[PDB]
Enzyme design. Structure first.
Site: not given
Ligand code: CL
Ligand code: CL
Ligand code: CL
Ligand code: CL
Ligand code: CL
Lengths: 338, 338
Positions: A51, A152, A242
């Site tokens: 990350y 979501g 994204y």
């Protein structure tokens, strides 16, 4: 009580329940009480290792959530006890009961919206809204296409787009009860719901004749699916990525880049937050809160799980076919959860 | 005498030498004499089938080249006999000896630059210049990275970039006499020349410590090579694709799009020409011609081949490891070519 990791790896084995003591409340400090915090991909990737950012181990996991301000430092006046807050920055460590943060590390959010909506504000609607605004200039009547639409972010895209008078084509993965799922996404404002299998047909491009070609595509899948998403864009359109996986890169045919003059971009909310002021982020939150009060935006189905039962939530979140999102809950509720 | 194809397929078998008769010269018409015309990928793809545009068969192949105006229509005054011209539009059919075109189909180019440079003006320097200007705002000292650097476009990029005071990192494919090739590209203005093999090393990103990260990358290879090209970009950089193959899509990792905020784009000179006026295209040509007179831009090594010996040139152009570019020549020269 905190969810802590001593090194990077599979969160199942890596993360464990530990006990800490709370720091002193300096003049600039704010002691909080965590109410809820989601398990997001970024949290999992921050545990796994791959990350953008990685705090100093041993670190507390989770990057998002909502907390109530309980106690406040000598000379902080912009935050009062009883205020709800969310993290201003990444890597704060939100999978905890209580902590101490500096007032600049926190951002006030209105405490009248539902708790679940506050907890998922960033990952979901903030991300959806920003993607809808920052890349293509969309007016009422314009279309948007996206994949992983049942997610979501996907559901937020559906609701926010509908609020903007936009018309969505929503790609989802093939499944036994596609009809039920289709109907639910449509009730949220989706105009069309199609499968990845349908998307791959050459006859898909002009399948929906009664709506314009999208200039914006939102991608979270990569691989051949992202190429097929690209294929639906009007000339000069943009596909924004994204999320996705390491071993599923985005794939763009030479002919689509050259002849259709398509643009591929990424979006990272953490980066946006850093490139903008607290006021600009506060403005985004208020806009979203207004949608939530106007009834134009509600949070999806989310299984609540206690901080104690993290293991259960941690593995369920890492389904290849991710079902209901896992929200770690620090409060008791009307119906007790063992 | 013309190079004609009756249908789409492998140019080797598909294209053949045929004889036609020349049309009437209307008031708006210009009869020309072809001097030279390159065999470009677009020409090959227009024969193969998979290209943005496809004229009406039976059609004449080739889209670029240079011709001398020989005769002129009643009321055309902007073109005089003796003027050199290049096509204003695609699909004119340039693999011919003579033709008749409307004055709007042609664009005058100065007749004092070398014949080879006139013939390859569009595919090579026009494309190189446009890519250097249209995507990132580059000032003297900024870097650019590209692959297939030994190509026609690659060599133009090197020369034009150097003319703009830019600093190039030039990727080429691995080969036995890399040193000779390296030295030649450097003499043209290349600062560094590296192999694809070198590019793939993790230690490549900050290998050249004495130069800034490029904000612009130019790609013609696709696959893993394009991903490794992407990897060298500064945050917020753009990779532009201007060629490649059908079965070698561009590949962009999720982390590079999201965390590095990279942009992927295409460039198509034909599209640019359509979106701009004759004056704007004329301005580009003049700029390039000035570079060619100032000694800042010369054409690469190019094997001249007669229109009769097209077969030889047609197969040699379709090497997987494309060597010297093939220029079809309609004129005799000082040294005769059988
Ligand atoms: Cl999907
Ligand atoms: Cl539908
Ligand atoms: Cl190369
Ligand atoms: Cl070098
Ligand atoms: Cl862009």
């Amino acid at each position: 009580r905190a969810l802590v990791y001593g090194h990077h790896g599979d969160p199942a084995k890596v993360v464990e329940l530990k006990n800490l003591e709370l720091a002193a409340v300096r003049g600039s400090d704010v002691r909080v009480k965590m109410l809820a915090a989601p398990i997001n991909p970024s949290d999992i990737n921050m545990i796994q290792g791959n990350y953008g950012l990685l705090p100093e181990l041993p670190a507390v996991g989770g990057n998002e959530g909502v907390a109530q301000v309980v106690a406040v430092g000598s000379n902080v006046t912009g935050l009062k006890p009883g205020d709800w807050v969310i993290p201003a920055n990444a890597g704060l460590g939100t999978w905890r009961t209580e902590a101490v943060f500096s007032e600049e590390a926190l951002i006030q959010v209105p405490s009248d919206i539902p708790l679940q909506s506050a907890a998922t504000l960033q990952v979901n609607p903030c991300t959806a809204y920003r993607m809808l605004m920052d890349f293509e200039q969309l007016q009422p009547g314009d279309s948007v296409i996206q994949n992983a639409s049942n997610s979501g972010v996907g559901q937020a895209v559906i609701q926010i787009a509908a609020a903007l008078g936009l018309r969505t084509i929503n790609v989802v993965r093939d499944r036994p009860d596609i009809q039920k799922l289709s109907d639910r996404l449509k009730s949220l404002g989706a105009e069309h719901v199609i499968t990845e299998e349908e998307l791959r047909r050459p006859e898909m491009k002009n399948f929906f004749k009664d709506m314009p070609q999208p200039r914006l595509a939102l991608n979270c899948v990569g691989g051949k699916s992202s190429t097929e998403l690209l294929r639906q864009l009007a000339r000069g359109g943009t596909m924004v990525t994204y999320g996705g996986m390491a071993k599923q890169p985005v794939v763009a045919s030479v002919s689509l880049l050259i002849f259709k003059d398509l643009k591929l971009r990424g979006f990272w909310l953490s980066q946006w937050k850093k490139d903008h002021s607290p006021d600009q982020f506060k403005e985004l939150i208020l806009t979203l809160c207004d949608l939530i009060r106007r009834g134009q935006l509600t949070a999806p189905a989310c299984s609540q799980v206690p901080l104690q039962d993290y293991q259960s939530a941690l593995e369920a979140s890492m389904k290849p076919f991710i079902s209901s999102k896992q929200i770690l809950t620090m409060l008791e509720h009307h119906h007790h959860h063992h």
